């Protein structure tokens, strides 16, 4: 495959994996583990269910599996299941012997330190990687853009987080989590569909509503317009066919679902949504740099892909500088240049950025935490990895 560093975005919803200088993930698959179950459902000799089924092998066969997720909110909940993703990732997707390899990992900006420690311990002591580096997921997405300033916001399956950057300095006091992302919009889609009477409360049906959200949802650009189309008109109604063959009608739930990123109170969170979170983050930066942040807001991660999200977010920041800085005076609004970067690749920007960064530091062997350094200092060897 390659002799250069391996890179692994072990995301909350998808693992993406490959090597330094890859222009796109070598593989990606759901970060799911399954165990065999029987369920008053179809059975077939067309496939054989092993005791542990993971990644693509599980998601293609999940009618037969008790599906479980090793991660939530960007943290590993169960390491015995994350070991069964990492075994699969290295031994039967990449088909590697990890002994002495160097690997780049990722995690979100405010995780428990016990998560990075036990993730590095596992890399040194199950697999025996020769070197490890862990990067904050949103600073990777800035190397993908070929860029060195402008606030980058990453929204994944687990967490939405923001990292302001100016002239290659990373503003660690302004980095932030919004604990609402692509999974809370999916648990919410199940809860909207339950008002229509459709039940999706089996563990294997969660991937079906992920595929449904990912297919049919869009972010409303103007809520009183989509509420007009929703209440006055049939035009929003769309038929989705489940893998069961059942057809379900979905309507206001197309815009009303991804709206929880802009209004977290719909999912019971008191936090401010994307527009108000990015504004209260840029507007907390020092006076000299705020222009260079509004001139380059960078979107990233799969939950930034909803149709209309770049346009809703740009509008909803022009609309919010207008309330909170101009106090509703139109005279200065045309002077407020805000720009959203919303590139075609952006779902993979954390991986594509990781694959750039893992080239920049492939040969600098002191830059990685080495296995030989881990085995003498333990967890204190990770203090190499910044503030």
């Amino acid at each position: 495959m390659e002799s250069a560093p391996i890179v692994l975005d072990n995301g909350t919803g998808f693992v993406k994996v490959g090597y330094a200088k890859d222009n796109f993930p070598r593989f990606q698959f759901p970060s799911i583990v399954g165990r065999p179950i029987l369920r008053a459902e179809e059975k077939t000799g067309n496939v054989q269910i092993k005791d542990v089924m993971v990644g693509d092998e599980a998601e293609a066969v999940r009618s037969l599996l008790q599906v479980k997720y090793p991660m939530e909110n960007g943290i590993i909940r169960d390491f015995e299941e994350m070991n069964q993703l990492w075994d699969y990732t290295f031994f039967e997707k990449l088909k590697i012997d990890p002994r002495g390899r160097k690997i780049l990992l990722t995690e979100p900006p405010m995780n428990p330190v016990a998560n990075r420690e036990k993730m590095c311990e596992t890399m040194f002591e199950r697999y025996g990687f020769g070197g490890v580096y862990v990067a904050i997921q949103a600073v990777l997405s800035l190397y993908a853009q070929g860029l060195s300033s402008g606030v980058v916001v990453d929204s994944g399956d687990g967490v939405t987080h923001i990292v302001p950057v100016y002239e290659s300095v990373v503003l660690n006091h302004l980095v932030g989590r919004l604990d609402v992302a692509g999974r809370d919009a999916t648990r919410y889609l199940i809860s909207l569909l339950l008002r229509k009477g459709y039940a999706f409360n089996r563990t294997a049906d969660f991937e079906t509503v992920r595929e449904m959200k990912e297919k049919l949802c869009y972010v409303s650009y103007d809520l009183e317009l989509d509420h007009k189309l929703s209440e006055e008109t049939t035009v929003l109604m769309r038929n989705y066919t489940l893998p069961d063959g059942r057809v379900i009608k979905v309507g206001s739930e197309r815009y009303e679902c991804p709206e929880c990123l802009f209004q977290p109170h719909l999912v019971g969170s008191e936090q401010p949504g994307l527009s108000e979170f990015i504004f209260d983050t840029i507007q907390a930066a020092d006076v000299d740099i705020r222009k260079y942040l509004y001139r380059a807001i960078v979107l990233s991660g799969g939950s930034s892909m909803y149709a209309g999200l770049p346009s809703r977010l740009e509008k909803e920041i022009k609309q919010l500088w207008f309330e909170r800085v101009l106090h509703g005076d139109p005279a200065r609004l045309p002077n407020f240049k805000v720009k959203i970067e919303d590139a075609p690749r952006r779902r993979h920007a954390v991986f594509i950025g990781g694959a750039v960064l893992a080239d920049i530091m492939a040969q600098n062997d002191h830059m990685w935490v080495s296995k030989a350094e881990w085995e003498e200092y333990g967890v204190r060897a990770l203090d190499k990895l910044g503030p």
């Binding site: 069961d244 063959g245 059942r246 057809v247």
Partner: protein, 316 residues
């Protein structure tokens, strides 16, 4: 149902329970009725003793037309001091109760029949005075028109029995006339009410139902009620008149006729509501035939074969 019950169902069912019961529980129950009437049923001193009480805004008028002698005739020993906030009250004791199941049944009926027993007093005053005028007119047929003329103005009853109505009635030697000065204030009931009142008059003019009272209608008042209080001609009232002849209140019929004429306006009010429930079931039938006129715009494709729950299937 095609026609309203005359009694309050709740008091009938409730007393039918307690008169059968081996072990009575306590109650405190206000119970609404038509024409703004309201009952209160409670067990104030013991679970053994039920106090039934009635509230009705026109009861002060009904006491002028001889009501208390009719209620003392009907309820006898069970009559009680009026409950504070109520016009009339009756105290029935479940241990001192009548013996047979048909005595219990007719007492539970009689107590539930209270609204039409309190509102019957002006009708019995008119029927019993028409029985006197019928004898005086049979003594001198040339004096009879003048007895009718004076009874038409001196023996007239008016009851303002709810604020959008008046019932006016009087005896003459061969009849009791009763006029409902009737109004529907709810505008969708006023629109249907024109149809329901018009077709009611036009029904009486057919061979099948000539045996009924002579009904008449207008919107101004009959000449003999044009100066009664609260009757006003311009205010979009309608004046349904029934003429009950001596054959419509013969001794076998009197009690059904009193029960059945009081409920008049309430059957029209009920049937105006129950006609919206009809028009809806007839509208959603025409909607279901316009479906066919759109279905010929869908192109013909077979939707795939599925199990009963909508899951996909693999045979044929």
């Amino acid at each position: 149902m095609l026609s309203l019950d005359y009694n309050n169902i709740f008091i009938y069912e409730l007393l039918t329970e307690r008169f059968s019961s081996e072990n009575p529980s306590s109650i405190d129950q206000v119970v609404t009725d038509f024409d703004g009437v309201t009952f209160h049923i409670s067990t104030p001193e013991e679970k053994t003793k039920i106090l039934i009480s009635l509230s009705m805004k026109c009861y002060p008028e009904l006491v002028n037309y001889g009501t208390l002698d009719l209620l003392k005739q009907i309820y006898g020993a069970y009559v009680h001091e009026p409950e504070m906030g109520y016009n009339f009250s009756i105290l029935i004791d479940l241990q001192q109760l009548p013996a047979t199941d048909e005595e219990k049944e007719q007492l539970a009926m009689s107590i539930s029949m209270l609204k039409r027993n309190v509102l019957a007093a002006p009708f019995h005053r008119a029927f019993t005075k028409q029985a006197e005028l019928a004898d005086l007119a049979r003594k001198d047929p040339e004096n009879a028109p003048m007895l009718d003329k004076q009874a038409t103005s001196q023996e007239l009853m008016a009851i303002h029995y709810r604020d959008e109505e008046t019932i006016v009635l009087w005896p003459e030697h061969d009849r009791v006339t009763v006029v409902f000065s009737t109004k529907f204030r709810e505008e969708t009931d006023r629109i249907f009410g024109k149809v329901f009142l018009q077709e009611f008059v036009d029904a009486r003019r057919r061979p099948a139902i000539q045996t009924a009272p002579q009904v008449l209608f207008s919107y101004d008042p009959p000449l003999e009620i044009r100066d009664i209080q609260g009757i006003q001609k311009g205010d979009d009232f309608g004046f349904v008149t029934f003429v009950l002849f001596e054959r419509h209140f013969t001794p076998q019929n009197r009690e059904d006729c009193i029960s059945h004429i009081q409920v008049f306006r309430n059957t029209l009010h009920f049937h105006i509501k129950a006609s919206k429930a009809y028009m809806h079931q007839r509208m959603r039938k025409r909607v279901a035939d316009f479906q066919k006129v759109l279905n010929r715009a869908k192109p013909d494709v077979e939707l795939e074969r599925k199990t009963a729950t909508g899951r996909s299937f693999v045979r044929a």
